[PDB]
Amino acid sequence: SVASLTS
């Protein structure tokens, strides 16, 4: 829920 996500 706190992981940095990309597109």
Place this chain on the structure above:
Amino acid sequence: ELRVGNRYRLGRKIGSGSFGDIYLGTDIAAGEEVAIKLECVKTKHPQLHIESKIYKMMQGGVGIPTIRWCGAEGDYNVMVMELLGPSLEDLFNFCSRKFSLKTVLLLADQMISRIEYIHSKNFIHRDVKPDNFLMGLGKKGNLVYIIDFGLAKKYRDARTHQHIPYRENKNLTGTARYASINTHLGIEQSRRDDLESLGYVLMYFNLGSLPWQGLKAATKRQKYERISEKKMSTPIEVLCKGYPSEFATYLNFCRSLRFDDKPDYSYLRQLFRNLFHRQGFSYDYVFDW
């Protein structure tokens, strides 16, 4: 001994994220401690060199860390940065996950200004969260810095100020806990989303947790579903219950901005500046820590 850039001795690992690992380093030239970000050169889509270009474009701004070295060495792209102090998440935990209203407002003023500065340089940050704000070192311990430009991107042309186009059907970018409602709806990020995320960061500081935090799920794809649902089902007025109305006013303002609208950074600062005075606080740089 092992030294990146022939100059920085590698120390222990201090963090890891989707865009590389962070290590302590020591500049043998000065003994200055530094932070060393490493990204594997085999990475799906290299990103650190682009992040470094963003940092270089922002140098000199208040609260922007200085980049000392960027190069490729061995199996890594390297970015060496000035070492800052603890993150706001670190300090929140140090403070037993309670911040006074005064500390929240002292922080809010600077964090709004940091975000405005990035926007003034034609970029949006897209990963606003407590881990990505660090206090300065020593004398600069009163200053909030912003880090982590690995998801940052231009939102307008530098010369014409033509805004990037609107689009939907995007996958979630950023962090699920702090993302804006429009990001969960698949909408392209813009200036408003950085500030909305900040609004959730500020209420997180007030509450100790957010209501969509710590939900039981199964897939990480269904993790996001439960978070999105709770975030949408919780009215801003319910989220902010027990706290001054300014926090709900802030969040409602951000949600009401149109996709390409310039936020009123001054209005938002004055909301929490007017509250600060009503509370009888002085801007004396005494934080909870």
